[PDB]
């Protein structure tokens, strides 16, 4: 939040500045919102806005062939453990399956299976 001093010229003693009243509210904490129009001199509330352009948007979009090689690094070391990677996932699903048999759970079984589905699609992308 910002707090602006008083240069007047629209004000002199007491007047009504700050057109375009919309969006958020006062907030702050306690004393600043106690006096707004009465005493505007040393403190009053404000709002914060940010301006962007078309070029500045793509400047932060660089997060996603350099990344192509880095994508194959995860599948490179996984080829050694590909037997041990799928084994630990299937054996984990076997214990989660017996959990539903003793109920008479689904969230723990769904989250475990979702991680296995994405790992199988990435391995196909290497071919």
């Amino acid at each position: 939040d910002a707090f602006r001093l008083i240069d007047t010229g629209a004000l002199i003693n007491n007047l009504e500045p700050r057109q375009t009243t919309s969006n958020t509210g006062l907030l702050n904490k306690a004393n600043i919102q106690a006096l707004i129009h009465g005493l505007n001199r040393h403190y009053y509330s404000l709002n914060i806005d940010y301006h962007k352009t078309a070029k500045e948007t793509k400047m932060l979009m660089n997060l996603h062939y350099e990344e192509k090689e880095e994508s194959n690094l995860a599948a490179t070391k996984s080829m050694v453990k590909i037997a041990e990677q799928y084994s630990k996932r299937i054996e984990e699903e076997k214990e989660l399956t017996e959990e539903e048999l003793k109920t008479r759970p689904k969230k723990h079984l769904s989250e475990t299976a979702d991680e296995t589905l994405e790992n199988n699609i990435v391995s196909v992308l290497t071919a």
Partner: protein
């Protein structure tokens, strides 16, 4: 039974064998169609043979090949080659289908060829085989005596030959039923026909249909002209009514075209009829001068408002928290609108002292809404507030210039030279603070005075105002040029205002030009797609705000299915809260054709997140349904009332104020609990600042003009929209940036009353009118079923539900013409045997002239 033996004889050469084998297939079809599909190449081979004359029967069977397989594309082509072999009167399952399938192919091929040329039905561009079968069903509908399907099938086929032939043949004399069928032709040309080119073509043909008959409805004549918006055909109405002038004919057309015609339509009727001669007593009626004067006496004497309502609301808060001084003038201007009552301002002295420059700017501007309707005293009462007299602040003079345009809006030809000369003198000298204040006020007054005017000097005077790099007076210049560009507007003004908006570093000027671009294109529909695409493609926040209003004004009234789809994608993908709320509120302008289906879309968008969106959806029922109202619209706005968010309650209370106008017991029982909640927010002192602002505005809209006026964008006479009401609501729909934008709502006030006019003396008589609406059933609030009748004189408060049973009494020798169409408004009367005047009602025009 197999088709092999019957189809094996077609491979030899004989005259009798080819005929006998072909006729055997036409008799047995539903059994043998299995093997015929494989032998189809052998059947179609004889169709191309010139020496084979049985192809009419061969193509008839070949058409049944694809007809039994479900493909109707090729079944129509081969069926037309049968000629006399295909019987129209057979009325079998094959005949009643292929003929119906040819109608669907006739509509699809006509609309695609209509854009290239409109004469395609006459020329050979269209398939003549599909035209012959199309005209056979036309004569079939004539034998059943149905004019709805006969004239309705030619609308979607884009052909003017059948409409002229069928309508003129059924004209008899008597002519009461012929006008109704022509009236249905106009109604079916709106909803069914979405194209403006074909809709205007029917209006040009429908006008000559009533002129050929000696007895025709004169109200339907103006209904066609205003829909077409052509001043050429309007001149033929006055020439026909010149030597035929009657007490109830030439006078009725004068008042009905006041609000129906646009600004450019009124300029031609006055100029053209001046050289050829015109009635000197009817001069001012075309311009609309007495129109505002007739309702000045109605609002002054019949005013039902109480002074205690504005006294308890104003005295509730004063001094500290000065944002509430705006809401005082909002509720004050509405209730006193048209009554010319200044006593409330001078009543409380401390309220004028606690007002600051921006607060006195609203208080001084409040005189324009209150004193509206009197154009003679407009500058006389506000004279001390006008420039030229030294005041305590410069903003006081600016408030008078804004209030100056409120009274003179559209009549400002007298005040045009006064406001324009101030702008020209301030165009070369600017940059000072006190100079920009006088320029900001004059730019607002000239906008309403020049509203609808094509004058270039007014646009050029406000064009150089934005080039001084001063945003103090620049906010008014952006909104001033938009009212001058209404309707067609200037084509070069689109690219100039759009390019300068991106190069402007001022916040108020950039947001003002986006609203002005929407005012440039009015009713353009697909013609505005060039500006709509460029505004939505920009990444700026303020440019995307005005892009939603451009679709609202261009598609206002009758809309397009592609216009709403564009508004939905802008309010979703874009993350700007101000742009999302601008697209959801624009949906009310495109739905103005039908107010019943408006809450269906609103109820889906009112439950979403981003409360800014829930505010724009709240007015969607207040922009459209305010003209009529619906009980389902209350349940949609019900959960928005309990929302603890401050700026949402402002959207709920204001939207319910316009729908509940003139509602009481045995009408809308929900008004009791809603109206009491308006005073509960003012009574409760624990509410926030924005919570009490909407309570003072909601109570002022319901009680506006002593509850003698309503807010309606359109009433059904000609079928068009009011320029002053629709454009004036666009500015009222936005309260966010500059608080007292509600003063633009005064242009949309529609009073509901029945004012009779005696054509002999062109005066206002006084007599009781027979009606079935009694205060025991249909009544109005003071400070369903109909049984017993009721009588009331002229110039009285009449509800829109009470205007259906209004009937004049002929014992006083007054012959009504329009009688009752189901709504209010001036109804010109007649006189049977004039002898002496009976009664007269003294209006404000007696004290002036």
């Amino acid at each position: 039974t197999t088709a092999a033996p019957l189809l094996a004889l077609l491979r030899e050469n004989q005259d009798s064998v080819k005929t006998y084998a072909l006729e055997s297939i036409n008799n047995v079809v539903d059994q043998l169609w299995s093997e015929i599909s494989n032998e189809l190449p052998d059947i179609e081979a004889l169709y191309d043979d010139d020496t084979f004359s049985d192809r009419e029967m061969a193509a008839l069977i070949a058409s049944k090949v694809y007809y039994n397989l479900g493909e109707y594309e090729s079944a129509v082509k081969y069926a037309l080659a049968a000629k006399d072999r295909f019987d129209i009167d057979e009325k079998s399952q094959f005949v009643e289908t292929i003929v119906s399938k040819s109608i669907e192919m006739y509509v699809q091929e006509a609309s695609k060829q209509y854009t290239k040329d409109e004469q395609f039905y006459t020329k050979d561009i269209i398939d003549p085989k599909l035209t012959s079968i199309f005209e056979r069903m036309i004569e079939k509908c004539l034998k059943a005596s149905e004019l709805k399907l006969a004239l309705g099938i030619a609308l979607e086929g884009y052909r003017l030959d059948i409409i002229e032939s069928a309508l003129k043949s059924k004209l008899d004399q008597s002519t009461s039923e012929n006008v109704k069928i022509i009236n249905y032709l106009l109604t079916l040309a709106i909803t069914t026909v979405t194209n403006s080119k074909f809709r205007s073509s029917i209006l040009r043909k429908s006008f000559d249909f009533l002129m050929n008959m000696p007895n025709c409805d004169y109200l339907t004549l103006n209904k066609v002209v205003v829909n077409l918006n052509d001043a050429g055909l309007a001149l033929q109405l006055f020439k026909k009514l010149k030597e035929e002038n009657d007490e109830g004919l030439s006078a009725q057309i004068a008042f009905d075209l006041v609000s129906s015609a646009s600004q450019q339509l009124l300029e031609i009727l006055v100029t053209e009829l001046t050289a050829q001669g015109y009635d000197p007593a009817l001069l001012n009626i075309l311009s609309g001068l007495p129109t505002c004067d007739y309702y000045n006496t109605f609002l002054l004497n019949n005013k039902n408002i109480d002074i205690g309502l504005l006294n308890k609301s104003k005295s509730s808060l004063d001094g500290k928290f000065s944002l509430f001084h705006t809401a005082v003038s909002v509720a004050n201007g509405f209730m006193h609108a048209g009554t010319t009552d200044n006593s409330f301002i001078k009543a409380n002295l401390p309220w004028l002292g606690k007002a600051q420059n921006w607060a006195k700017f609203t208080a001084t501007a409040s005189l324009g809404v209150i004193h509206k309707g009197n154009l003679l005293e407009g500058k006389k009462v506000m004279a001390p507030y006008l420039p030229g007299s030294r005041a305590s602040s410069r903003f006081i003079k600016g408030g008078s210039l804004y209030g100056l345009g409120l009274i003179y809006a559209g009549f400002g030809r007298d005040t045009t030279d006064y406001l324009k000369n101030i702008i020209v003198e301030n165009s070369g000298t600017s940059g000072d603070e006190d100079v920009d204040v006088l320029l900001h006020g004059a730019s607002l007054g000239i906008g309403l005075a020049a509203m609808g005017s094509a004058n270039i000097e007014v646009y050029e005077a406000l064009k150089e105002v934005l080039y001084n790099d001063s945003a103090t007076s620049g906010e008014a210049a952006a909104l001033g040029m938009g009212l001058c560009m209404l309707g067609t507007g200037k084509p070069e003004a689109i690219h100039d205002m759009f390019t300068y908006s991106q190069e402007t570093q001022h916040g108020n000027i950039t947001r003002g030009l986006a609203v002005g671009l929407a005012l440039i294109n009015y009713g353009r529909q697909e013609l505005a797609d060039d500006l709509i695409t460029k505004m939505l493609a920009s990444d700026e926040s303020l440019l995307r705000y005005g892009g939603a209003f451009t679709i609202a004004l261009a598609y206002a009234g009758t809309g397009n299915n592609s216009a709403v789809k564009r508004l939905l994608h802008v309010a979703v993908s874009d993350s700007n809260d101000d742009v999302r709320r601008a697209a959801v509120i624009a949906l009310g302008f495109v739905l103005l054709r039908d107010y019943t289906t408006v809450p269906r879309i609103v109820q889906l968008l009112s439950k979403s997140h981003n409360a800014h969106v829930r505010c724009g959806t709240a007015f969607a029922l207040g922009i459209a349904c305010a003209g009529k109202g619906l009980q389902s619209a209350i349940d949609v706005l019900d959960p928005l009332t309990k929302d603890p968010v401050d700026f949402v309650r402002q959207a709920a209370m204001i939207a319910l104020s316009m729908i509940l106008i003139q509602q009481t017991e045995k009408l809308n029982p929900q008004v009791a609990d809603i109206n009491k909640n308006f005073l509960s927010v003012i009574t409760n002192k624990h509410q926030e600042g924005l919570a009490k602002f909407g309570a003072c505005v909601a109570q002022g809209i319901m009680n506006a003009g002593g509850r003698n006026v309503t807010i309606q964008l359109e009433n059904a006479d000609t079928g068009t929209l009011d320029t002053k009401s629709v454009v004036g609501l666009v500015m009222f729909s936005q309260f966010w940036y500059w608080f007292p934008l509600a003063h633009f709502l005064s242009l949309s006030f529609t009073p509901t009353t029945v004012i009779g006019i005696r054509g002999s003396d062109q005066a206002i008589p006084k007599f009781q009118m027979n009606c079935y609406a009694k205060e025991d059933a249909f009544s109005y609030p003071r400070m369903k079923y109909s049984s017993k009748p009721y009588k009331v004189d002229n110039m009285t408060r009449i509800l829109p539900q009470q205007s259906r049973y209004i009937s004049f009494i002929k014992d006083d020798r007054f012959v009504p013409v329009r009688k009752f169409k189901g709504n209010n408004g001036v109804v010109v009367l007649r006189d049977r045997e004039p002898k002496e005047p009976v009664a007269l009602i003294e209006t404000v025009r007696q004290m002036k002239d």
